[PDB]
């Protein structure tokens, strides 16, 4: 409601670099807030699309950014009879970026891994392997919980138990307040999905350059399941952390699954041991249920509620019986041990083919009314199919179904405006959070300063 669309700011990078995909705030020790924008298609040194991450300062006018430097060179090692290789071409470094405190974990979900043995091999599978850096201190480390030398024949004879080869680790990167690095690997364990948590401090303090295959002591991962219901969950598509147990000691893991229970979709809530506590099936099948989650306290009571996006929520109309307008569900959290049940609120879109709900961002007390507000994405909403960002406000009963403020796309058609959203950080020290939105079609990022 107070996010002005007149005064804009435009950070652009290389052309044809898909800049602006994954973007985050970054607060230093002195309180200055920088911006860490990913760009999974920026060219590397070898004239190849090795991705990139640009650390853009806060400038009122925007412009170009100085890129962070990471090891973008292929590594080869010979340990015993095994030859370890890591491949960085077409890795999309920046496709999932997260920054916590003073550490930038800019992750490349497609850094491949392979192991050779005479004639046999472990296959170059997109395990995903993602980097860490501390620009203020200049310390560098890497982590990849799904690296193993198990051969193809052994996996075939065993029949695919504990298969992390297809992890794509770092895809869903959320860092706990405690300091634990949580990764989501929707391709692991027979292409059902997993979750991988290891400490950030252990990651920094247990990495040695030049060793491709090593394991952290504190690595704790999920468990494979033979349940035919669970097949192809993509479990880990978007991890979220919040208080869903009642005990402050345990930070529970909210995990989305686009496909479950015969192509329905689900959103699960599990503890630090990855044991199931709650599970919310999809209300309408294959309607984009199981991707977007946003653990935020919408009602203001103090209990962390839940949001789920569903941009392909098709409904009925009068002229024609089809209306793909997308829908954002609300699941409140009842007092006591009662589980989350029917969807407390159903937010409807209006523009057909609107793609409404592709990203949900908790913008905090945007109006300083006392309740958390969210901004639901729409890459191709609006009358001309250019893009919309719809801001829904929070209240005691939930969310107002009327978008208080809709931001139209400065960029031309095809920019996918509104794809990635981040909030709840005061970039101008004016008292209200300033929202930044990524559009990779225009290779630009629009920073709105709240009034």
């Amino acid at each position: 409601l107070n996010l002005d669309p007149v005064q804009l700011t435009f950070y652009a990078g290389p052309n044809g670099s898909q800049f602006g995909f994954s973007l985050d705030f970054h607060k230093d020790s002195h309180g200055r807030v920088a911006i860490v924008v990913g760009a999974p298609r920026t060219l590397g040194p070898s004239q190849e699309e090795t991705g990139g991450v640009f650390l853009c300062p806060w400038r009122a006018e925007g412009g170009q950014c100085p890129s962070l430097l990471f090891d973008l060179r292929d590594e080869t090692r010979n340990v015993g009879s095994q030859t370890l290789q890591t491949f960085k071409a077409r890795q999309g470094l920046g496709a999932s970026v997260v920054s916590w405190s003073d550490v930038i974990v800019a992750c490349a979900p497609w850094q491949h891994w392979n192991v050779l043995e005479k004639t046999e091999e472990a296959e170059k599978t997109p395990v995903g392997s993602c980097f860490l850096a501390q620009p203020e201190s200049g310390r560098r480390a890497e982590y990849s919980p799904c690296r193993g030398n198990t051969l193809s024949r052994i996996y075939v004879e065993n029949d695919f138990s504990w298969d992390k080869r297809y992890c794509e680790a770092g895809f869903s990167s959320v860092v706990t307040q405690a300091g634990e690095l949580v990764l989501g690997a929707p391709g692991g364990y027979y292409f059902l999905g997993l979750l991988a948590q290891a400490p950030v401090a252990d990651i920094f303090s247990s990495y040695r350059p030049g060793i491709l295959l090593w394991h952290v002591s504190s690595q704790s991962l999920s468990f494979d399941s033979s349940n035919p219901e669970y097949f192809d969950g993509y479990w880990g598509y978007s991890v979220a952390v919040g208080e869903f147990d009642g005990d402050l000691n345990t930070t529970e893991y909210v995990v989305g699954a686009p496909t479950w229970s015969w192509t329905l979709g689900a959103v699960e809530i599990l503890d630090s041991y990855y044991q199931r506590l709650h599970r919310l099936r999809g209300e309408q099948m294959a309607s984009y249920f199981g991707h977007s989650v946003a653990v935020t306290d919408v009602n203001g009571d103090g209990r962390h509620d839940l949001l789920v996006g569903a941009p392909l929520y098709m409904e009925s109309r009068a002229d024609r019986k089809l209306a793909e307008v997308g829908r954002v569900y609300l699941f409140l959290q009842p007092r006591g041990p009662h589980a989350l049940g029917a969807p407390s609120l159903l937010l409807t879109g209006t523009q057909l083919y609107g793609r409404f709900g592709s990203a949900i961002a908790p913008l905090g007390d945007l109006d300083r009314d006392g309740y958390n507000d969210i901004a639901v994405a729409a890459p191709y909403g609006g009358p001309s199919g250019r893009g919309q960002v719809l801001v829904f406000l929070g209240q005691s009963e939930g969310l107002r179904s009327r978008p208080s403020q809709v931001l139209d796309s400065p960029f031309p058609t095809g920019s996918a405006f509104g794809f990635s959203l981040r909030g709840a950080v005061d970039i101008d020290d004016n008292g209200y959070p300033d929202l930044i939105v990524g559009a990779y079609g225009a290779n630009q990022v629009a920073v709105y300063r709240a009034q």
Partner: protein, 374 residues
């Protein structure tokens, strides 16, 4: 307040030739003149005629689990032609395919040897992955489907779901590429045995650009934008197949038939069936699917301005009328089913000329109703 028939033609009985003037709906054009704050009604006499040419595009899944079904399609064209001949004297058959996006993590990109054939480790030869691969255009020659099959091979993708939705759009919108007839009823048979892919299965492969209704099949008979375009959604999948007057027929196995029968509710003009895992039960599936979709006369309204709405009454088989019904079921060949529509406008719009169509789903002929105000 006049609704004089601007043009009307006699409904045909049997079609031996000159299909361009079948005129399966009467009246064709009616000029509507509604005074402000009033209503008017017009009569409709839809009647589907026998021997109405149709064209059928057989879209099929061809993943590794989809192999054994392909061993029973070598003579589908001859068998389908004989069965459909009893109900239509002119048939057109097409063929398509799909596996998934040829991209990581769906294909065997390692070692560089495996990039030419994924199934190298089990001593088998399979084609590289492809998202959509048009093979045959709809031609009235029966032998085209027989020759096209037994030439195509089977690819191999890792996960269970496939890129079927990508192939269906390229069937829907590439009308010139495949050869849709404008004076026929179109049946799209989509056969699969496993799950299918939806939107935001893209970021798992880095393929984020969403699908649009455009036709990206170039001169190579290939979905040229396979590795850069996303999957199509439900509104894209047909709202775009309603637009081309097309009927979609799922043909899926029992282990997945539950969702598809649960999914035809949100997409109209669709009849789900059960496909035996040897694809020996698809010939009877398609024939029975048309029988239900034919004797289910609906009434879809296109380009209806918001200034007015339509009220529907039905006069189905037997003189019994059903108020508040816009569709009749349980018909057969040659049935004449009447309808009653009352048009109500609010005041008088400042346009004085508008035109909307009253059309039976999947059928060319429609009532081009022209509404004027005075």
């Amino acid at each position: 307040s006049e609704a004089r028939v601007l043009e009307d033609r006699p409904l045909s009985d049997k079609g031996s030739g000159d299909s361009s003037q079948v005129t399966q709906v009467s009246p064709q054009r009616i000029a509507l003149r509604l005074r402000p704050d009033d209503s008017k009604n017009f009569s409709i006499q839809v009647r589907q005629v026998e021997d109405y040419p149709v064209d059928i595009y057989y879209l099929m899944d061809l993943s590794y689990s989809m192999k054994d079904d392909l061993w029973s399609i070598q003579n589908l064209g001859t068998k389908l032609a004989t069965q459909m001949r009893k109900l239509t004297s002119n048939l057109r058959i097409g063929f398509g395919a799909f596996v998934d996006k040829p991209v990581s993590p769906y294909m065997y990109i390692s070692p560089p040897e495996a990039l030419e054939n994924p199934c190298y480790d089990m001593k088998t030869t399979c084609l590289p992955m492809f998202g959509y691969k048009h093979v045959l255009t709809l031609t009235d020659q029966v032998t085209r489907f027989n020759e096209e099959v037994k030439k195509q091979s089977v690819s191999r993708n890792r996960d269970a779901p496939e890129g079927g939705f990508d192939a269906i759009m390229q069937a829907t919108v590439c009308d010139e590429k495949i050869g849709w007839r404008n004076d026929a009823s179109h049946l799209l048979v989509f056969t699969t045995d496993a799950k299918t892919h939806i939107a935001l299965d893209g970021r798992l492969a880095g393929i984020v650009q969403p699908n649009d209704g455009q036709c990206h099949v170039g001169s190579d008979n290939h979905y040229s934008a396979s590795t850069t375009m996303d999957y199509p959604s439900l509104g894209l999948m047909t709202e775009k197949l309603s637009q081309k007057n097309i009927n979609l027929i799922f043909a899926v196995t029992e282990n997945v038939v539950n969702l598809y029968q649960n999914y035809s509710e949100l997409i109209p003009g669709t009849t789900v069936g059960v496909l035996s895992m040897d694809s020996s039960n698809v010939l009877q599936l398609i024939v029975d699917a048309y029988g239900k979709i034919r004797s289910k006369v609906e009434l879809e309204v296109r380009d209806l301005p918001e200034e007015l709405s339509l009220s529907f009454n039905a006069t189905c088989l037997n003189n019994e009328v059903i108020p508040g019904l816009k569709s009749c079921m349980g018909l057969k060949i040659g049935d004449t089913v009447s309808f009653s529509i009352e048009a109500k406008v609010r005041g008088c719009p400042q346009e004085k000329e508008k035109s909307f169509t009253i059309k039976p789903v999947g059928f060319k002929d429609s009532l081009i109703v022209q509404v004027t105000f005075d």
